[PDB]
Subunit: 89 residues, 2 copies
């Protein structure tokens, strides 16, 4: 899954779809214990002229996971991985 959120045994990791747009339109934001990855693909040609996929990907941090230990990372394939180990780690 390249769009899945899951707290592992003792580690919080997330994959996210950023295949067709860029850091410039990918607004990875957080709000305390919140992770709002406001992604966006503008000028998106498809089956009907242009569209856009503007996201508000607001998912929260488990109470047992430290926001500060969570780090995002965007691959060349366009997969944004937001992952921080538990507070226990």
């Amino acid at each position: 899954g390249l769009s899945e959120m899951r707290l592992e045994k003792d580690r919080f990791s997330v994959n996210l779809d950023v295949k067709h747009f860029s850091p410039e339109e990918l607004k990875v934001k957080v709000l305390g214990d919140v992770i709002e990855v406001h992604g966006k693909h503008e000028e998106r040609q498809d089956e009907h002229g242009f569209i856009s996929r503007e996201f508000h990907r607001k998912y929260r941090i488990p109470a047992d996971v430290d926001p500060l230990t969570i780090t995002s990372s965007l691959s060349s394939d366009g997969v944004l991985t937001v992952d921080g180990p538990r507070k226990q780690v």
Copy 2:
């Protein structure tokens, strides 16, 4: 195809995805010979907490199709059909 634009023999018809959101967030707009169906699904729970699908579905009207003859229609299944016959019709 429920998201396909195609000028038929002599008739312009479009299907569009509006399965998970409503006329209130579905901003069917046009700009002259342009059809910008700025759709939007906010508060969209998925594999990672909430997201949103805010669209800018800007596809243009064939020069042989009358904008005035194009009418949209949203089904109970959440399919928006934007369809107007040619100017020839």
